[PDB]
Design a protein around this ligand. Structure first.
Ligand SMILES: *[C@@H]1O[C@H](CO)[C@@H](O[C@@H]2O[C@H](CO)[C@@H](O[C@@H]3O[C@H](CO)[C@@H](O)[C@H](O)[C@@H]3O)[C@H](O)[C@H]2NC(C)=O)[C@H](O)[C@H]1NC(C)=O
Ligand SMILES: *[C@@H]1O[C@H](CO)[C@@H](O[C@@H]2O[C@H](CO)[C@@H](O[C@@H]3O[C@H](CO)[C@@H](O)[C@H](O)[C@@H]3O)[C@H](O)[C@H]2NC(C)=O)[C@H](O)[C@H]1NC(C)=O
Lengths: 438, 52
């Protein structure tokens, strides 16, 4: 017997579904969302890490001259100087007084620990949702893991379940992402091959083990001071170290809808938004024949106390008359009130109790015990505790019933005004008819 | 790593007054888990009093 329904995508919400087969007693299922995971698809762009300057020893060729030779190294810099007269601890070598030259060399290279501490630049699109749902009905417990899209069917005790695609298509990740350890940043990084010195991405590598490297750190050489051998140079500080100190905020403390961001793999968990359609297919063994279920007649509903609080702050009493004792399915047909139990013990005494939670001043709903029906109305007073540490267990519906006190007063005043207007209309019509008949 | 003491909460009408007692610079941050959150983060150094 195929069935369909929609359930809120709120973790821990006690959703209950009612199935009414016309040849069998009604059945009630319970579905609860334990855990979700929004999984985006990532494309790696480049990898950034702290750089390291390699400066070989100078080659002081003296009583001669040297010529610079080009090389294919990242950000290579080389120059030749004339007129150096170096000194060492034991004295000064290079006999030639002024006909000496020194060749300076330097370039940039990826650091030694780049493969343990680096930042990744990604492109994120087309998130995929995954969830873990707990279902119970009759005597069947169990939790399952399901991809939330209309193309995964899971069987739980002979029943086929298909969880449809999410109603909304909202993702907390922007188009471009920078990932560092366990933090996700919504950042717009410079393109590969166009990095600027001193900022994020001054040196870039296509992959952590890739041989190619593009480095732009404005390495510049300077003439050595007289009588020393030191190869001076100047260079703009590393951009990765700068980014570490002024990245600013994150996405873990910035994401909406109160969902935690985790890494490896990048995902957003327990992130309440939208609705999850559910498609079901149940066998005949789950239902019960109508002859076996007890017959319930003369069902009346009364309310003892009501306080529209987050927890179950309502007590309900049902009176009935039955022939035998067994088990019924208890359901509420309106979302203004949510019942705590899905099954109740029916007995020849004729009194059962239930618990419900509401968020409206004057709720009104219809409750069914097996096949009987009854209508409940209540007057609920506000609670006294200002703040509680647990989520709401109701559907957050505030509009009162048309039979409530405020709506009753509105009805009375409107009826009085309408009666006055109707009397006005009648008098005017009578006068006009008398005038016309003359 | 040490764990800082639990702050003292004072309930109000859709508002919480929060007492903070640090021994050394700790990071304090909060956010509202609605449709449009309201961010904050800070480096608390001495005893303070914040309303959230
Ligand atoms: C031992 O010390 C003597 C010091 O005199 C070195 O002689 C020097 O040798 C260089 C190499 O040829 C000379 O440089 C040349 O200078 C002329 C211009 O004078 C230039 O046209 C050449 O192209 C070349 O650059 C240098 O002049 C010469 N010193 C003097 C005072 O003339 C000698 O080389 C040293 N021995 C060794 C093995 O290094
Ligand atoms: C279906 O299976 C789940 C998981 O086994 C059942 O939930 C479990 O219910 C028991 C009580 O019946 C929980 O034990 C108690 O948990 C409280 C939590 O504060 C603890 O303080 C107690 O000392 C005791 O251990 C158990 O924690 C709970 N499991 C989980 C994961 O929440 C569930 O009841 C089963 N379905 C039905 C209809 O019974």
């Amino acid at each position: 017997y195929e069935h369909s329904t929609v359930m809120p995508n709120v973790v821990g919400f006690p959703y209950k579904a009612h199935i009414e087969r016309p040849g069998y007693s009604p059945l009630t299922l319970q579905m609860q969302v334990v855990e979700t995971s929004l999984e985006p698809t990532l494309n790696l762009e480049y990898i950034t890490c702290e750089y390291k300057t390699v400066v070989p020893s100078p080659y002081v060729k003296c009583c001669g001259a040297s010529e610079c030779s080009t090389k294919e190294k990242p950000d290579y810099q080389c120059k030749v100087y004339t007129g150096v007269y170096p000194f060492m601890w034991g004295g000064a070598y290079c006999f030639c007084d002024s006909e000496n030259t020194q060749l300076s060399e330097a370039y940039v290279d990826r650091s030694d620990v780049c493969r343990h501490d680096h930042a990744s630049a990604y492109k994120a699109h087309t998130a995929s949702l995954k969830a873990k749902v707990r279902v119970m009905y009759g005597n069947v417990n169990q939790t399952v893991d399901v991809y939330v899209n209309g193309d995964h069917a899971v069987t739980i005790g002979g029943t086929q379940f298909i969880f449809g695609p999410l109603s909304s298509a909202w993702t907390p990740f922007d188009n471009k992402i920078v990932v560092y350890k366990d933090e996700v940043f919504n950042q717009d990084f410079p393109p590969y091959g166009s990095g600027q010195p001193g900022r994020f991405g001054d040196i870039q590598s296509r992959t952590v083990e890739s041989n190619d490297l593009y480095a732009n750190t404005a390495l510049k050489l300077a003439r050595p001071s007289p009588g020393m051998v030191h190869v001076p140079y100047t260079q703009t500080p590393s951009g990765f170290k700068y980014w570490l100190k002024e990245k600013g905020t994150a996405l873990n403390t910035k994401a909406p809808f109160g969902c935690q961001i985790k890494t490896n793999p990048v995902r957003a968990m327990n992130c309440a938004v939208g609705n999850i359609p559910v498609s079901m297919n149940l066998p005949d063994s789950a239902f019960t024949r109508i002859v076996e279920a007890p017959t319930i007649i003369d069902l009346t509903c009364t309310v003892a106390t009501c306080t529209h609080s987050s927890d179950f702050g309502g007590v309900l009493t049902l009176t009935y008359k039955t022939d035998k004792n067994g088990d019924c399915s208890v359901h509420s047909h309106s979302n203004v009130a949510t019942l705590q139990e899905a099954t109740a013990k029916v007995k020849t005494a004729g009194k059962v109790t239930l618990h419900f939670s509401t968020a409206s001043a004057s709720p009104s709903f219809v409750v069914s015990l097996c096949s009987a029906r009854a209508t409940c109305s209540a007057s609920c007073e506000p609670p006294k505790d200002h703040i509680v540490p647990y989520a709401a267990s109701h559907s957050n519906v505030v509009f009162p019933d048309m039979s409530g006190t405020a709506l009753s007063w509105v009805q009375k005043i409107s009826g009085g005004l309408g009666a006055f207007a109707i009397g006005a209309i009648l008098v005017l019509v009578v006068v006009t008819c008398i005038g016309l008949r003359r | 790593v040490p764990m800082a003491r639990e702050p003292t909460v004072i309930h109000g009408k859709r508002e919480v007054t929060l007492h903070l007692h640090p021994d050394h610079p700790t990071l304090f941050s909060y956010r509202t888990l609605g449709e449009d959150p309201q961010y904050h983060e800070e480096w608390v150094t001495a005893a303070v009093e914040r309303t959230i």
